[PDB]
Protein backbone atom coordinates (compact mmCIF):
# COMPACT_ATOMS: atom_id res chain seq x y z
CA UNK A 1 0.00 0.00 0.00
CA UNK A 2 1.23 3.52 -0.59
CA UNK A 3 -0.17 5.78 2.13
CA UNK A 4 -1.08 9.41 1.91
CA UNK A 5 0.53 11.67 4.55
CA UNK A 6 -2.72 12.44 6.39
CA UNK A 7 -3.95 8.83 6.23
CA UNK A 8 -0.64 7.67 7.64
CA UNK A 9 -0.72 10.37 10.32
CA UNK A 10 -4.15 9.23 11.46
CA UNK A 11 -3.11 5.54 11.54
CA UNK A 12 0.07 6.35 13.42
CA UNK A 13 -1.91 8.41 15.93
CA UNK A 14 -4.38 5.57 16.47
CA UNK A 15 -1.31 3.44 17.29
CA UNK A 16 -0.12 5.97 19.89
CA UNK A 17 2.83 7.56 18.07
CA UNK A 18 1.82 11.21 18.62
CA UNK A 19 4.42 12.45 21.17
CA UNK A 20 5.57 8.86 21.86
CA UNK A 21 8.78 9.17 23.88
CA UNK A 22 9.06 12.84 23.01
CA UNK A 23 8.54 12.55 19.23
CA UNK A 24 5.57 14.53 17.92
CA UNK A 25 3.52 12.85 15.15
CA UNK A 26 5.09 14.80 12.27
CA UNK A 27 8.46 13.26 13.06
CA UNK A 28 7.09 9.78 12.36
CA UNK A 29 5.30 10.81 9.16
CA UNK A 30 8.43 12.62 7.94
CA UNK A 31 10.53 9.54 8.69
CA UNK A 32 8.19 7.34 6.66
CA UNK A 33 8.14 9.81 3.76
CA UNK A 34 11.89 9.74 3.34
CA UNK A 35 12.50 6.11 4.35
CA UNK A 36 9.94 4.51 2.02
CA UNK A 37 7.89 7.24 0.30
CA UNK A 38 4.99 5.84 2.32
CA UNK A 39 5.22 2.40 0.64
CA UNK A 40 4.46 -0.48 3.03
CA UNK A 41 6.24 -2.92 0.67
CA UNK A 42 9.54 -1.02 0.40
CA UNK A 43 12.43 -3.44 0.70
CA UNK A 44 16.12 -2.41 0.49
CA UNK A 45 18.63 -5.28 0.49
CA UNK A 46 22.05 -4.34 1.90
CA UNK A 47 25.51 -5.81 1.25
CA UNK A 48 26.10 -6.76 4.93
CA UNK A 49 23.48 -9.47 4.61
CA UNK A 50 20.79 -7.35 6.21
CA UNK A 51 17.64 -5.86 4.69
CA UNK A 52 15.50 -2.83 5.57
CA UNK A 53 11.77 -3.57 5.53
CA UNK A 54 8.56 -1.68 5.16
CA UNK A 55 7.24 1.82 5.58
CA UNK A 56 9.85 2.66 8.26
CA UNK A 57 12.71 0.62 6.70
CA UNK A 58 13.46 -1.35 9.85
CA UNK A 59 16.60 -3.45 9.64
CA UNK A 60 16.94 -7.22 9.97
CA UNK A 61 20.16 -7.31 12.02
CA UNK A 62 18.82 -6.03 15.34
CA UNK A 63 15.08 -5.79 14.85
CA UNK A 64 13.23 -8.46 12.80
CA UNK A 65 14.08 -12.00 11.71
CA UNK A 66 14.57 -12.82 8.03
CA UNK A 67 16.84 -15.87 8.55
CA UNK A 68 19.54 -14.57 6.24
CA UNK A 69 21.11 -11.81 8.33
CA UNK A 70 24.31 -12.30 10.36
CA UNK A 71 24.22 -11.27 14.01
CA UNK A 72 20.43 -11.43 14.23
CA UNK A 73 18.88 -10.25 17.50
CA UNK A 74 15.19 -10.07 16.51
CA UNK A 75 14.49 -7.56 19.25
CA UNK A 76 10.98 -6.83 17.91
CA UNK A 77 10.24 -10.60 18.03
CA UNK A 78 8.70 -10.64 14.55
CA UNK A 79 9.38 -12.02 11.12
CA UNK A 80 10.51 -9.23 8.78
CA UNK A 81 7.55 -10.16 6.57
CA UNK A 82 5.26 -8.63 9.19
CA UNK A 83 6.90 -5.30 8.40
CA UNK A 84 5.64 -5.55 4.78
CA UNK A 85 1.94 -5.68 5.73
CA UNK A 86 -0.47 -3.15 4.40
CA UNK A 87 -1.65 -2.54 7.97
CA UNK A 88 1.03 -0.74 9.97
CA UNK A 89 0.66 -2.74 13.26
CA UNK A 90 3.99 -4.52 13.24
CA UNK A 91 5.96 -1.56 11.94
CA UNK A 92 4.58 0.80 14.61
CA UNK A 93 5.09 -1.68 17.44
CA UNK A 94 8.64 -2.36 16.30
CA UNK A 95 9.35 1.39 15.94
CA UNK A 96 8.18 1.80 19.55
CA UNK A 97 10.54 -1.05 20.61
CA UNK A 98 13.50 0.63 18.89
CA UNK A 99 12.93 3.75 20.98
CA UNK A 100 12.12 1.73 24.12
CA UNK A 101 15.54 0.10 23.71
CA UNK A 102 17.17 3.51 24.08
CA UNK A 103 17.58 4.63 20.50
CA UNK A 104 16.37 7.99 19.42
CA UNK A 105 14.79 8.58 16.10
CA UNK A 106 18.41 8.98 15.06
CA UNK A 107 18.10 5.23 14.46
CA UNK A 108 16.35 6.17 11.19
CA UNK A 109 18.95 7.60 8.84
CA UNK A 110 16.31 9.38 6.79
CA UNK A 111 14.89 11.04 9.90
CA UNK A 112 18.36 12.24 10.89
CA UNK A 113 18.96 13.58 7.39
CA UNK A 114 15.61 14.84 6.18
CA UNK A 115 13.66 15.56 9.24
CA UNK A 116 15.63 16.47 12.39
CA UNK A 117 15.53 20.22 13.07
CA UNK A 118 12.96 21.05 10.38
CA UNK A 119 9.31 22.11 10.76
CA UNK A 120 8.12 18.52 10.96
CA UNK A 121 4.61 19.64 11.94
CA UNK A 122 4.14 20.54 8.30
CA UNK A 123 3.77 16.80 7.63
CA UNK A 124 0.51 16.67 9.63
CA UNK A 125 -0.77 20.15 8.76
CA UNK A 126 -4.29 20.11 7.40
CA UNK A 127 -4.91 16.48 8.38
CA UNK A 128 -8.00 15.13 10.15
CA UNK A 129 -6.74 13.65 13.43
112 vs 39: CA distance, rounded Å = 19
**From residue 123, how far is each of 24, 26, 48, 117, 128 by CA, in Å?**
11, 5, 33, 13, 12
Ordered DSSP codes for 69-91: -TT---TT-SBGGGGG-SS-HHH
Buried-state track 64-88, b at ≥16 Cβ within 10 A, e below 16: bbbeebeebebbbebbbebbbeeeb
Is there a catalytic annotation at residue 52? yes
Q: Which of 52, 66, 87, 119 is catalytic?
A: 52
69: closest CA among 58, 78, 57, 61? 61
CATH of domain 1-129: 1.10.530.10
Domain boundaries, the chain: 1-129
Half-sphere exposure of 128 (CA within 13 A, CB side): 2
Resolution in A: 1.0
Question: Is-contact 105 19, C-beta < 8 A?
Answer: no
* Helix-helix angle 5-14:25-36, to 10 degrees: 130
Technique that determined the structure: X-ray
88 vs 84: CA distance, rounded Å = 8
Q: Annotated binding site: which residue ranges?
A: 101
Q: Annotated binding site for substrate: which residue ranges?
A: 101
15 vs 88: CA distance, rounded Å = 9
Question: Is-contact 99 23, C-beta < 8 A?
Answer: yes
Amino acid sequence: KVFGRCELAAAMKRHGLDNYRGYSLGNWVCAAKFESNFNTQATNRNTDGSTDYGILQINSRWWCNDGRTPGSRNLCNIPCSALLSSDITASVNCAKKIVSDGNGMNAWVAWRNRCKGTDVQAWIRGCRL
